[PDB]
Enzyme design. Sequence first.
Site, PDB file in Angstrom:
ATOM      1  N   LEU A  15      59.221  39.500  86.615  1.00  0.00           N
ATOM      2  CA  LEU A  15      59.491  40.092  85.311  1.00  0.00           C
ATOM      3  C   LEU A  15      58.508  39.642  84.250  1.00  0.00           C
ATOM      4  O   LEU A  15      58.172  40.406  83.336  1.00  0.00           O
ATOM      5  CB  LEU A  15      60.925  39.802  84.870  1.00  0.00           C
ATOM      6  CG  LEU A  15      62.001  40.401  85.781  1.00  0.00           C
ATOM      7  CD1 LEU A  15      63.384  40.007  85.292  1.00  0.00           C
ATOM      8  CD2 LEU A  15      61.858  41.916  85.865  1.00  0.00           C
ATOM      9  N   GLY A  16      58.050  38.401  84.373  1.00  0.00           N
ATOM     10  CA  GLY A  16      57.015  37.874  83.497  1.00  0.00           C
ATOM     11  C   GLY A  16      56.961  36.363  83.505  1.00  0.00           C
ATOM     12  O   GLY A  16      57.693  35.700  84.261  1.00  0.00           O
ATOM     13  N   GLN A  19      57.574  30.352  78.433  1.00  0.00           N
ATOM     14  CA  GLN A  19      57.538  28.919  78.204  1.00  0.00           C
ATOM     15  C   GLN A  19      57.852  27.997  79.389  1.00  0.00           C
ATOM     16  O   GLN A  19      57.390  26.865  79.430  1.00  0.00           O
ATOM     17  CB  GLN A  19      58.511  28.573  77.078  1.00  0.00           C
ATOM     18  CG  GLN A  19      58.312  27.167  76.568  1.00  0.00           C
ATOM     19  CD  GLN A  19      56.954  27.028  75.943  1.00  0.00           C
ATOM     20  OE1 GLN A  19      56.170  26.117  76.250  1.00  0.00           O
ATOM     21  NE2 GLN A  19      56.651  27.958  75.067  1.00  0.00           N
ATOM     22  N   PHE A  20      58.664  28.439  80.327  1.00  0.00           N
ATOM     23  CA  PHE A  20      59.042  27.539  81.411  1.00  0.00           C
ATOM     24  C   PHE A  20      58.523  28.083  82.727  1.00  0.00           C
ATOM     25  O   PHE A  20      58.987  27.693  83.774  1.00  0.00           O
ATOM     26  CB  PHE A  20      60.565  27.371  81.470  1.00  0.00           C
ATOM     27  CG  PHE A  20      61.166  26.772  80.231  1.00  0.00           C
ATOM     28  CD1 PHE A  20      61.895  27.563  79.348  1.00  0.00           C
ATOM     29  CD2 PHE A  20      60.984  25.431  79.931  1.00  0.00           C
ATOM     30  CE1 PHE A  20      62.472  27.013  78.199  1.00  0.00           C
ATOM     31  CE2 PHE A  20      61.545  24.873  78.789  1.00  0.00           C
ATOM     32  CZ  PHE A  20      62.288  25.668  77.916  1.00  0.00           C
ATOM     33  N   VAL A  22      57.512  31.213  85.486  1.00  0.00           N
ATOM     34  CA  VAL A  22      57.814  32.554  85.992  1.00  0.00           C
ATOM     35  C   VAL A  22      59.295  32.960  85.792  1.00  0.00           C
ATOM     36  O   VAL A  22      60.209  32.130  85.881  1.00  0.00           O
ATOM     37  CB  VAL A  22      57.348  32.708  87.482  1.00  0.00           C
ATOM     38  CG1 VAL A  22      58.102  31.761  88.410  1.00  0.00           C
ATOM     39  CG2 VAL A  22      57.493  34.136  87.978  1.00  0.00           C
ATOM     40  N   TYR A  83      70.935  40.211  83.793  1.00  0.00           N
ATOM     41  CA  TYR A  83      69.686  40.946  83.850  1.00  0.00           C
ATOM     42  C   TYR A  83      69.636  42.002  82.732  1.00  0.00           C
ATOM     43  O   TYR A  83      70.624  42.674  82.464  1.00  0.00           O
ATOM     44  CB  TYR A  83      69.504  41.591  85.222  1.00  0.00           C
ATOM     45  CG  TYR A  83      68.262  42.481  85.326  1.00  0.00           C
ATOM     46  CD1 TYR A  83      66.975  41.926  85.217  1.00  0.00           C
ATOM     47  CD2 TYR A  83      68.378  43.876  85.512  1.00  0.00           C
ATOM     48  CE1 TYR A  83      65.852  42.727  85.291  1.00  0.00           C
ATOM     49  CE2 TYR A  83      67.257  44.675  85.614  1.00  0.00           C
ATOM     50  CZ  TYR A  83      65.999  44.099  85.495  1.00  0.00           C
ATOM     51  OH  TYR A  83      64.850  44.874  85.576  1.00  0.00           O
ATOM     52  N   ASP A 128      64.700  29.467  67.639  1.00  0.00           N
ATOM     53  CA  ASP A 128      63.530  30.285  67.929  1.00  0.00           C
ATOM     54  C   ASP A 128      63.874  31.748  67.911  1.00  0.00           C
ATOM     55  O   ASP A 128      63.424  32.522  68.741  1.00  0.00           O
ATOM     56  CB  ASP A 128      62.939  29.851  69.283  1.00  0.00           C
ATOM     57  CG  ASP A 128      61.527  30.337  69.504  1.00  0.00           C
ATOM     58  OD1 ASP A 128      60.856  30.847  68.571  1.00  0.00           O
ATOM     59  OD2 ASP A 128      61.097  30.249  70.678  1.00  0.00           O
ATOM     60  N   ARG A 132      60.731  38.638  70.255  1.00  0.00           N
ATOM     61  CA  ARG A 132      60.221  38.271  71.557  1.00  0.00           C
ATOM     62  C   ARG A 132      61.294  37.535  72.371  1.00  0.00           C
ATOM     63  O   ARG A 132      61.208  37.536  73.603  1.00  0.00           O
ATOM     64  CB  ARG A 132      58.964  37.396  71.476  1.00  0.00           C
ATOM     65  CG  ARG A 132      59.239  35.999  70.938  1.00  0.00           C
ATOM     66  CD  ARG A 132      58.006  35.142  70.773  1.00  0.00           C
ATOM     67  NE  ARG A 132      58.474  34.025  69.992  1.00  0.00           N
ATOM     68  CZ  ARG A 132      58.378  33.975  68.669  1.00  0.00           C
ATOM     69  NH1 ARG A 132      57.757  34.962  68.020  1.00  0.00           N
ATOM     70  NH2 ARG A 132      58.883  32.931  68.020  1.00  0.00           N
ATOM     71  N   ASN A 133      62.276  36.918  71.692  1.00  0.00           N
ATOM     72  CA  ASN A 133      63.395  36.221  72.379  1.00  0.00           C
ATOM     73  C   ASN A 133      64.689  37.025  72.447  1.00  0.00           C
ATOM     74  O   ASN A 133      65.770  36.472  72.605  1.00  0.00           O
ATOM     75  CB  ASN A 133      63.655  34.818  71.797  1.00  0.00           C
ATOM     76  CG  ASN A 133      62.494  33.862  72.042  1.00  0.00           C
ATOM     77  OD1 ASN A 133      61.894  33.880  73.106  1.00  0.00           O
ATOM     78  ND2 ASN A 133      62.159  33.043  71.049  1.00  0.00           N
ATOM     79  N   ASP A 146      67.840  32.923  75.347  1.00  0.00           N
ATOM     80  CA  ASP A 146      67.291  31.564  75.314  1.00  0.00           C
ATOM     81  C   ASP A 146      67.674  30.759  74.091  1.00  0.00           C
ATOM     82  O   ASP A 146      66.928  29.879  73.657  1.00  0.00           O
ATOM     83  CB  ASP A 146      65.769  31.584  75.494  1.00  0.00           C
ATOM     84  CG  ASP A 146      65.351  32.195  76.809  1.00  0.00           C
ATOM     85  OD1 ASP A 146      64.166  32.561  76.897  1.00  0.00           O
ATOM     86  OD2 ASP A 146      66.182  32.319  77.748  1.00  0.00           O
ATOM     87  N   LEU A 149      67.215  26.737  73.833  1.00  0.00           N
ATOM     88  CA  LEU A 149      66.347  26.202  74.916  1.00  0.00           C
ATOM     89  C   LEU A 149      65.086  25.505  74.357  1.00  0.00           C
ATOM     90  O   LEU A 149      64.415  24.776  75.094  1.00  0.00           O
ATOM     91  CB  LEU A 149      65.947  27.296  75.925  1.00  0.00           C
ATOM     92  CG  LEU A 149      66.927  27.676  77.053  1.00  0.00           C
ATOM     93  CD1 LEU A 149      66.341  28.735  77.987  1.00  0.00           C
ATOM     94  CD2 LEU A 149      67.309  26.471  77.896  1.00  0.00           C
TER      95      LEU A 149
END
Length: 265
Positions: A15-16, A19-20, A22, A83, A128, A132-133, A146, A149
Amino acid sequence: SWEIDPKDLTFLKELGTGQFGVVKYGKWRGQYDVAIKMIKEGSMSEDEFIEEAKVMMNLSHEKLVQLYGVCTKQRPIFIITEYMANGCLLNYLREARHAFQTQQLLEMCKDVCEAMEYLESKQFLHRDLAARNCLVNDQGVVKVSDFGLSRYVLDDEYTSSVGSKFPVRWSPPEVLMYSKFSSKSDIWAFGVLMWEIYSLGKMPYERFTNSETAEHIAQGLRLYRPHLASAAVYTIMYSCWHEKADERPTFKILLSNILDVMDEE
Ligand SMILES: CS(=O)(=O)c1ccc(C(=O)Nc2cccc(-c3cn4ccnc4c(Nc4ccc(C(=O)N5CCOCC5)cc4)n3)c2)cc1
């Protein structure tokens, strides 16, 4: 409890990265679609996250990406979540093909506001918040991902105020200058997220660098009204960016304002 057996996981497609490391799309127990963050060794404060994933498994809301569990009796560790078929909100916003009505943009803001109001009720900071999150499901519902996190990120470029990956553009002055994190700092990020949505995925302060952005906001200057935002909508997001942190509304107030605009417009 929280511990998913890795035998219950099949990894299907990628999926991409973030930060952590894959993130993979897969199936849990041969039935349930899942995203699986495979945690890149060296990237996370794993013991602290493990110790705190319990608290996180109790955060359950319709507008939060649901944690399903963790696999922690192994390296790398995995984190299993709901998902979200339509992926990252920022990308979603950016595809001209959706040709969103402003009503759909406001619903996106409401989705995130519901989630954040719930987080606020539990006194839990995101730290955060940004498009994008946020993720989009198959029904076009936006959920916050996230949350919390950020505290387990070992990369100093992301965590230091002066780091190259610090979310400077989503941060209030008191975070940038004094590391003053609070419910009001998430509120600030929330208003910037509304600007992100109403500008269809532009970079906030698109013509400024990070440093230039910090000076701009310290001079008391703010983001301009996206064309698609009505005066009412702009007022909501602008209320998130009061210089005095205590004068920024709560997510409960913002929710009732958004619902009002929905009714009015
Ligand atoms: C800058 S760019 O190249 O446009 C670009 C930027 C970001 C991404 C991206 O998906 N990043 C990312 C990072 C970590 C976790 C996640 C990520 C985390 N999740 C948690 C729950 N659901 C998801 C999810 N869902 C996705 C993501 C992407 C697609 C998708 O259609 N893709 C097209 C084909 O290649 C795979 C992606 C479909 C579902 N993606 C997402 C993909 C492209």
